[PDB]
Design an enzyme around this catalytic site. Structure first.
Site, PDB file in Angstrom:
ATOM      1  N   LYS D  96     -17.823 -16.326 -39.362  1.00 29.83           N
ATOM      2  CA  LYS D  96     -18.302 -14.949 -39.355  1.00 29.83           C
ATOM      3  C   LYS D  96     -17.121 -13.994 -39.228  1.00 29.83           C
ATOM      4  O   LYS D  96     -15.961 -14.415 -39.275  1.00 29.83           O
ATOM      5  CB  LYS D  96     -19.311 -14.755 -38.228  1.00 29.83           C
ATOM      6  N   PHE D 142     -33.264  -7.157 -30.903  1.00 34.55           N
ATOM      7  CA  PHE D 142     -32.720  -6.243 -31.898  1.00 34.55           C
ATOM      8  C   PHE D 142     -31.379  -6.761 -32.399  1.00 34.55           C
ATOM      9  O   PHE D 142     -30.396  -6.795 -31.652  1.00 34.55           O
ATOM     10  CB  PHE D 142     -32.558  -4.845 -31.302  1.00 34.55           C
ATOM     11  N   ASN D 200     -21.441 -12.839 -33.315  1.00 28.21           N
ATOM     12  CA  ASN D 200     -20.675 -13.623 -34.278  1.00 28.21           C
ATOM     13  C   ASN D 200     -20.360 -14.988 -33.686  1.00 28.21           C
ATOM     14  O   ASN D 200     -20.140 -15.123 -32.479  1.00 28.21           O
ATOM     15  CB  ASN D 200     -19.375 -12.919 -34.683  1.00 28.21           C
ATOM     16  N   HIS D 203     -21.572 -20.784 -37.874  1.00 25.04           N
ATOM     17  CA  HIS D 203     -23.003 -20.982 -38.084  1.00 25.04           C
ATOM     18  C   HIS D 203     -23.402 -22.445 -37.929  1.00 25.04           C
ATOM     19  O   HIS D 203     -22.654 -23.355 -38.289  1.00 25.04           O
ATOM     20  CB  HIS D 203     -23.405 -20.481 -39.469  1.00 25.04           C
TER      21      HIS D 203
END
Ligand SMILES: Nc1nc2c(ncn2[C@@H]2O[C@H](COP(=O)(O)OP(=O)(O)OP(=O)(O)O)[C@@H](O)[C@H]2O)c(=O)[nH]1
Ligand SMILES: Nc1nc2c(ncn2[C@@H]2O[C@H](COP(=O)(O)OP(=O)(O)O)[C@@H](O)[C@H]2O)c(=O)[nH]1
Ligand SMILES: Nc1nc2c(ncn2[C@@H]2O[C@H](COP(=O)(O)OP(=O)(O)O)[C@@H](O)[C@H]2O)c(=O)[nH]1
Ligand SMILES: [Mg+2]
Lengths: 51, 46, 428, 372, 426, 427
Positions: D96, D142, D200, D203
């Site tokens: 990221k 959020f 971040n 992944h």
């Protein structure tokens, strides 16, 4: 007269087509000379890296 | 193992005797059930 | 602009025109549903959208083999009427196809030529593929050579015909049907190039390495001999050659129009990167009987004329230094009255290999179309088989049954005899 | 005994036909052998060969045998399918926006875990492909900061093949939240690296079935993939790095640490190249000048390259003289601080291949991802 | 497009055609309830040759089934294939013929042809273009040789253009099953030569050989000798029904084979025969098929072909094939045994090629052949006749039903002069 | 221009002669796939010696691969460089290689000799000037010493001027793995001393004992001896494809070497051979190799030097050396050995210095002897024949295959002419 007229019409249409293609081919030969000059520019960078 | 030993022993597993087989037996074909649906022509595979 | 309306017929021309009209898809950009992805207008014709629909006419009598091409890969390309159907096969006889089953179908095929020829602004001539080996190609089409030549007058016409083989012969009654149909087309076909089937099955085993071949494996070697002939009306090059030169250099006389055929580079894909493809090696291969597509030996007879067409990277000095060393061979003999005896046509385009072929991607092709008087001994056997059968009056009664007379057995024998004493008056 | 067989695929240069063979490898003795499935006769007989490795026996990784280049296409056998393909599974990862300046230690942890890296390329995705990543996610929190980081910060997509790749990736990653991972205080890629929890990270897919959805979201088929993820020029577009074989040696993490040292940035990495034409296109300046040109194109023939655009940062040391002299032994004579003395593995065919003249870096970079 | 009208008569016929009409059900994927459940799409292409259309996708044949007694077509409906054969196409009588010719040719089978000819002329004009005819019938009985030869006679009087074919069940010359075989088989072959073009002679003595020494079955029925006869029937039309390399129809082997109006008595065959237990040790290739069908022990009439010279020999093939390897095999069987052909025809062998082999096979072929050693199929009947004419052995049956002895006397002057043409050429 | 046509017959020379095509193709830089793979430019401009080119500019060799049985053509299509040969001029056969001379010539050799001459022609008639024939044979059986004679006696009728230099393994002094040998070998020396113009020799016994004494190997396989022979034949054919300072072709070697027509069997060698442990304790000069050239225990022949006064030693140097150091040290070895060089020749030696070292060593060379000690290999095999003939011990097969008794006297009588015409100039 019918054969001569139809034949001359198709000949002049393909002749203007070959005319456009020939002017495009002259630009293509200038493009090939441009690629030759860019190969010369790569030879100039080769001269600098040779140094 | 009398006369005709091997074939008569072998055929029973793959396959009132005359009354049952009066219509016939599957002689001229393979034991496999289907070899249809072959899209195998010269102008189709070529 | 330089269109070439070809004609296939028989059970030959529908299994030839699947692999001969396959390369015309490939040498241009023509995909098998009629689209570009203009030197192609010899064999294609363009509508408003993009669709290049072909020009030739393929005929049979039974529909069993025409039904493949409308249901095979190539259906949307071919026209929905240019493939012309029928209902029943002429079944290996000259009687049915010349008077009964080729008479009721002749005047819609005559319609569709006139529809196809008149849209062709610049058609040059007609190319005919009729097989002497059956009932349709002998019967439906030797009706046409006395029907096209009456309507369309004095046009050039040439044949790439499927002559039956000397040792193998598929059907029985062919020394009637091969002899009978040659009597009618002898003054209505200005050239007659010939091939055989055994004579290419030799070549696909000894030059290619593939034994157990197919007709489709044989068809592309006829499907490649067409496009080194027609390419001089197609593509750019040093020397182009029209179809008014094949009947010019190669046909000396009125009743001598029977040359031979050979196609030079016949090497597999596995052996492509080894042998040097020199222009001498491509040239001196054609003069050898092992390379030759008619089972006949030229060492017993004299040449009479020759021709050549070249492809790809031709160095035109070295062809003239390879033709010149042929002249110092006394094994190759010539008759005196053709002391020049050649023709060269040179294009630029190298040959194109089909995806899934046997020949390699080669760069230099040579095709001879040679007149030779040693084709006359191929006419010797087909007369030698005739009276050895006609004496017993065997197999006759279907010939007279469908509206003929017995007496044109008495002439198509006696017409070849004058031809058999025609070819010895000329190679003397 | 216990041979492993494969189906091989080589492009014949003279007659341009694609050719299919059957290769055989014999683990425990080093033999290879090659028959032809197309024509049953034997052309290549049995031989011993030393450079091939069992980690090089993976489907797809393109290995040279006797100066021929081939990609292993199929499994011709059920034995080797059971022996390897049941275990070798793929997992998806992505660097990221925050991890570009800290990727060296994470890549070293991945190389210590032993996953084979197939494709690790920077990418800037299009609108629909960017939204397809966030289409699946829905919950109470959020995610505006993470969404802006994905749509703004550059990223890289990578594929790691390993035995139980999902399980080993989960055990290396550990807890999900950053504060929860730090409170758990185990050594983990999420505990030591990553910023602000969901902002971040690298992944990691949740399940083996969902790994397909995650991989299709991040790196789909190349319709709208996006060829570039970095600026074409920044007035110093003059440094190109490339790693053809030292990625197979495994020192990519350590050389990322040494280039992160002395304050040098890294801009863009990718792992796609054709063995010859793409390299020839940019070894063109090198064509007339360099000697041992055959070797210098052979060790780029050998493997894929994680090739990377980089800019000049300080004028005190030039990046070319940080890269070092053209020979590792000359580097070890002069100074151990040279990157050949630290990492260089061949006599002239150095570990990092660069450009010499400073002008052509911009054109080489624009070729390498703007055109390609 | 080229349909086939099928004829049947006798009880000898209607066990064979009941076995003929199931391999057509096998190859076209027809279940015994009238529908179609085959997995191909080429099998549905030319379905119309043997399967007329109806509602619901039903496919019901072009079949004619005739006898003079009700006792046989009860069993044909009661077979495994009852729903497929048409109920309006069971024409029946009441009294059995009982091994006599004029019981079917002049009196009781003669009053009933006006109901058979109603069925045919309605049905044969429903075909868009018929190719021709076929018959499997008893020369041995009283219905096939008696009634059915009228249907060969009277239908040919209507349309002289089409082609007559016959799967003749000719009697054996060694062991006989009826004491009036030298009358019903003698008189029937008096009208075959002016009327019928293809004549396939079949012997059961020739077929009791093949299901023992080649298929290796110790207990053979008729229904497993009927299938080899039912193999060669659908083994003729292999090329009209399907695409391939060289298609051929039933006018294409009636031109390549019969050089004269009266030399047309064929000799049938079938190529790939091997045991049921040892099926997977052979290699089913091109040299295996040709080496069997060129022999005397693969022949469906009981005459040895080695005592004469074949005038003409046909063939047909099926399955994906390499045509040069057959072409090497056909010249070898013309170059090696050149003494087993006559020298006054150049080419004697024809071939034709399909594309799809049968369900369970890969390479198939069928042998059809003219041969002048079929004299021993006719001289044994022609020498049985005059050994009982001279003793007037059964003439009171024949005179008391509307015959003469001048219809008897001329029926061997045909049979002698038939052999007095075949004799010269061998 | 300058070229050599090649063939590979017999099992023994097929493995060695195809071990030749890697020691060539790595010096010159060809990949197995036929592309150029060289480091330097100098070794491409004399590639037309051994190699014919192919379209696209890839490179194929001049070789002919023919032997009686297809066992070993499936062994020389092998792993390293099998792809390069032309698949058309590969030749196989059907009948067995049953070691009979009529199987060499009369029975099996008759059907191939029409085909296996047209593999010489198709690679020679497309040329400019022919200079050498290199044939890798043996001297044991009817496989390699019935085909080695056959493929050179046919040629001499049509290619008579040029030079035909084969390379042949001679029988070992202890144990041979063929028992039928001197019916063929003495019947093949009847043509090899006649037709050929130079014909080499190799022991198998001495090839092992270099590996134990100097190399100090533990386990010499049959893959090692291939390398030791292939390097010698690839060093004597280098002044014909390299730059150099003192350069000689194969016909210089016709007039340099043989004084009387029938004495042309030479003794190979290779100088700087050493072990692994002793490299750092060895120095490389021109005097330090020269001892190892003239080492009694570095030759390929088991014959001791005391029986041999060398006629024409030719040591072809290859490297970057000095021409005086060559000339002073090819003479300082000669006054020290007066009795072991002939008194009727004043300069007994000959050098040739070149410019391209081998791949791997900075400098090497190639001894070639010509000794009067090779009567010991002559006295061996002529003595095996005399006892076996009077028994007619194995003559049943050759007479069964068609070789008469009166010719085996004649072959040994003319093999007796290779010591009798040798003994005149021994003294
Ligand atoms: N080698 C080869 N021969 C072919 C090919 N197509 C047809 N033939 C030959 O053509 C002949 C077939 O006869 P037909 O083509 O049917 O003759 P026809 O003129 O159509 O006469 P009918 O069948 O009565 O309609 C045989 O000799 C085949 O060998 C082909 O594609 N390759
Ligand atoms: N192989 C075989 N022979 C049959 C079959 N049906 C009848 N036959 C023979 O036919 C002959 C008898 O015919 P027949 O019943 O009198 O004819 P029909 O009275 O007209 O029905 C006998 O010699 C049988 O051998 C059959 O299905 N298979
Ligand atoms: N270099 C090498 N030499 C071999 C090999 N196999 C056999 N030889 C030699 O070949 C000899 C066999 O005798 P030979 O003359 O070849 O018998 P022939 O093949 O019948 O002519 C043995 O003595 C070995 O020295 C091998 O694999 N490599
Ligand atoms: Mg036809």
């Amino acid at each position: 007269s019918i054969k001569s007229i139809e034949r001359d019409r198709l000949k002049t249409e393909w002749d203007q087509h070959n005319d456009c293609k020939f002017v495009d081919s002259l630009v293509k030969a200038r493009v090939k000379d441009a690629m030759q000059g860019f190969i010369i520019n790569t030879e100039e960078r080769r001269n600098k890296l040779r140094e | 193992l009398l006369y005709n030993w091997e074939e008569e022993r072998a055929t029973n597993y793959l396959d009132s005797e005359s009354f049952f087989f009066r219509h016939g037996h599957r002689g001229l074909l393979t034991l496999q059930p289907q070899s249809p649906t072959s899209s195998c022509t010269t102008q189709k595979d070529s | 602009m330089r269109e070439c309306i070809s004609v296939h017929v028989g059970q030959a021309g529908v299994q030839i025109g699947n692999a001969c009209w396959e390369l015309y898809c490939l040498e241009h950009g023509i995909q098998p549903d009629g689209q570009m992805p203009d030197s192609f207008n010899t064999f294609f014709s363009e509508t408003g959208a993009g669709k290049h629909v072909p020009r030739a006419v393929f005929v049979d009598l039974e529909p069993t083999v025409i039904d493949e091409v409308r249901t095979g890969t190539y259906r949307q390309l071919f026209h929905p009427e240019q493939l012309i159907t029928g209902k029943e096969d002429a079944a290996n006889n000259y009687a049915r196809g010349h008077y009964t089953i080729g008479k009721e179908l002749i005047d819609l095929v005559l319609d569709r030529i006139r529809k196809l020829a008149d849209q062709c602004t610049g058609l040059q001539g007609f190319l005919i593929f009729h097989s002497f080996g059956g009932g349709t190609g002998s019967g439906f089409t030797s009706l046409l050579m006395e029907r096209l030549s009456v309507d369309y007058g004095k046009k050039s016409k040439l044949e790439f015909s499927i002559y039956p083989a000397p040792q193998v012969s598929t059907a029985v009654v062919e020394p009637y049907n091969s002899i009978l149909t040659t009597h009618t087309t002898l003054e209505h076909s200005d050239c007659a190039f010939m091939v055989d089937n055994e004579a290419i099955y030799d070549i696909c085993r000894r030059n290619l390495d593939i034994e157990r071949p197919t007709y489709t494996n044989l068809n592309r070697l006829i499907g490649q001999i067409v496009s080194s002939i027609t390419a001089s009306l197609r593509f750019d090059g040093a020397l182009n050659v029209d179809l008014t030169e094949f009947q010019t250099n190669l046909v000396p006389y009125p009743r001598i129009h029977f040359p031979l055929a050979t196609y030079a580079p016949v090497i597999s894909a596995e052996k492509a990167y080894h042998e040097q493809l020199s222009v001498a090696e491509i040239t001196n291969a054609c003069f050898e009987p092992a390379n030759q597509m008619v089972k006949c030996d030229p060492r017993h007879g004299k040449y009479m004329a020759c021709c050549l067409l070249y492809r790809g990277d031709v160095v035109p000095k070295d062809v003239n230094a390879a033709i010149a060393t042929i002249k110092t061979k006394r094994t190759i003999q010539f008759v005196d009255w053709c002391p020049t005896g050649f023709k060269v046509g040179i294009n630029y385009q190298p040959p194109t290999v089909v995806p899934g072929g046997d020949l390699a991607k080669v760069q230099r092709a040579v095709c001879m179309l040679s007149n030779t008087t040693a084709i006359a001994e191929a006419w010797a056997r087909l007369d030698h088989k005739f009276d050895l059968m006609y004496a017993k009056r065997a197999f006759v009664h279907w010939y007279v049954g469908e509206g003929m007379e017995e007496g044109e057995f008495s002439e198509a024998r006696e017409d070849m005899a004058a031809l058999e004493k025609d070819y010895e008056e000329v190679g003397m | 005994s216990e041979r492993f067989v494969f189906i091989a695929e080589w492009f014949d240069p003279n007659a341009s036909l694609f050719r299919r063979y059957e290769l055989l490898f014999y683990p425990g003795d080093g033999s290879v052998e090659m028959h032809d499935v197309k024509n049953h006769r034997t052309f290549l007989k049995r031989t011993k060969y030393e450079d091939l490795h069992l980690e090089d026996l993976f489907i797809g990784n393109k290995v040279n045998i006797f100066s021929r280049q081939l990609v292993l296409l199929d499994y011709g056998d059920q034995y080797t399918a059971r022996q390897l393909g049941s275990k070798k599974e793929k997992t998806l990862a992505l660097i990221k926006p925050d991890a570009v300046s800290k990727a060296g230690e994470i890549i070293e942890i991945i190389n210590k875990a032993g996953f084979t890296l197939t494709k690790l390329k920077m990418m800037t995705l299009s609108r629909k492909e960017a939204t397809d990543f966030h289409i699946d996610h829905q919950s109470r929190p959020f995610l505006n900061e993470l969404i802006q980081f994905i749509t703004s910060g550059p990223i890289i997509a990578m594929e790691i093949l390993r035995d139980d790749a999902v399980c080993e990736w989960k055990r290396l990653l550990g807890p999900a939240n950053s504060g929860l991972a730090r409170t758990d205080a185990p050594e983990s890629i999420r505990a030591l690296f990553g910023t602000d929890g969901i902002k971040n990270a690298a992944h990691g897919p949740d399940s083996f079935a969902c790994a397909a959805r995650e991989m299709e979201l991040f790196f789909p088929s190349s319709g709208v993939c996006g060829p570039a993820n970095t600026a074409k020029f920044t007035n110093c577009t003059t440094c190109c790095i490339v790693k053809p074989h030292a990625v197979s040696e495994g020192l990519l993490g350590k050389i990322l640490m040494t280039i992160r040292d002395a304050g040098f940035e890294i801009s863009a990495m990718q792992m796609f190249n054709m063995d010859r034409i793409n390299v020839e296109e940019f070894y063109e300046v090198y064509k007339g000048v360099v000697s041992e040109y055959n070797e210098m194109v052979t060790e780029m023939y050998s493997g894929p390259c994680v090739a990377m655009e980089i800019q000049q940062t300080n004028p005190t040391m030039t990046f070319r003289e940080f890269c070092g002299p053209a020979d590792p032994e000359i580097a070890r004579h002069l100074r151990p601080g040279t990157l050949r003395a630290i990492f260089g593995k061949t006599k002239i065919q150095n570990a990092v291949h660069c450009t010499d003249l400073p002008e052509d870096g911009l054109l080489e970079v624009q070729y390498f991802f703007k055109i390609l | 497009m080229r349909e086939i009208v099928h004829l049947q008569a006798g009880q000898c016929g209607n066990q064979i055609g009941a076995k003929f009409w199931e391999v057509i059900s096998d190859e076209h994927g027809i279940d015994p309830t009238g529908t179609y459940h085959g997995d191909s799409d080429l099998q549905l292409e030319r379905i119309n040759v043997y399967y007329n259309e109806a509602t619901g996708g039903k496919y019901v044949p072009r079949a004619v089934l005739v006898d003079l007694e009700p006792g046989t077509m009860d069993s044909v409906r009661s077979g495994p294939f009852g729903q497929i054969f048409r109920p309006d196409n069971f024409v029946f009588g009441q009294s059995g013929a009982g091994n006599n010719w004029a019981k079917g040719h002049y009196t009781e089978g003669a009053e009933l042809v006006d109901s058979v000819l109603d069925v045919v002329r309605k049905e044969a004009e429903s075909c868009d273009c018929l190719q021709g005819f076929q018959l499997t019938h008893s020369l041995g009985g009283g219905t096939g040789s008696g009634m059915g030869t009228l249907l060969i006679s009277k239908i040919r009087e209507e349309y002289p253009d089409r082609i007559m074919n016959t799967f003749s069940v000719v009697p054996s010359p060694k062991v006989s099953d009826t004491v009036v075989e030298p009358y019903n088989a003698t008189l029937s072959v008096h009208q075959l030569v002016e009327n019928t073009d293809e004549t396939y002679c079949i012997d059961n003595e020739a077929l009791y050989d093949i299901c023992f020494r080649t298929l290796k079955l110790t207990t053979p029925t008729y229904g497993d000798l009927n299938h080899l006869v039912s193999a060669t029937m659908s083994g003729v039309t292999t090329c009209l029904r399907f695409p391939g390399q060289l298609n051929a129809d039933l006018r294409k082997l009636a031109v390549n084979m019969v050089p004269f109006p009266r030399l047309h008595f064929f000799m049938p065959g079938f190529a790939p025969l091997t045991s049921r237990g040892s099926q997977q040790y052979r290699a089913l290739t091109v040299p295996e098929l040709t080496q069997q069908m060129f022999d005397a022990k693969n022949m469906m009439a009981a005459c040895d072909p080695r005592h004469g010279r074949y005038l003409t020999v046909a063939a047909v093939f099926r399955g994906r094939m390499s045509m040069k390897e057959v072409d090497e095999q056909m010249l070898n069987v013309q170059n090696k045994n050149s003494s087993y052909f006559v020298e006054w025809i150049p080419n004697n062998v024809k071939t034709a090629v399909c594309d799809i082999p049968p369900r369970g096979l890969k390479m198939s072929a069928t042998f059809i052949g003219n041969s002048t050693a079929i004299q021993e199929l006719f001289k044994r009947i022609s020498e049985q006749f005059t050994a009982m004419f001279r003793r007037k052995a059964f003439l009171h049956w024949y005179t008391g039903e509307g015959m003469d002895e001048m219809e008897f006397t001329e029926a061997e002057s045909n049979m002698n002069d038939l052999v007095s043409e075949y004799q010269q050429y061998q």
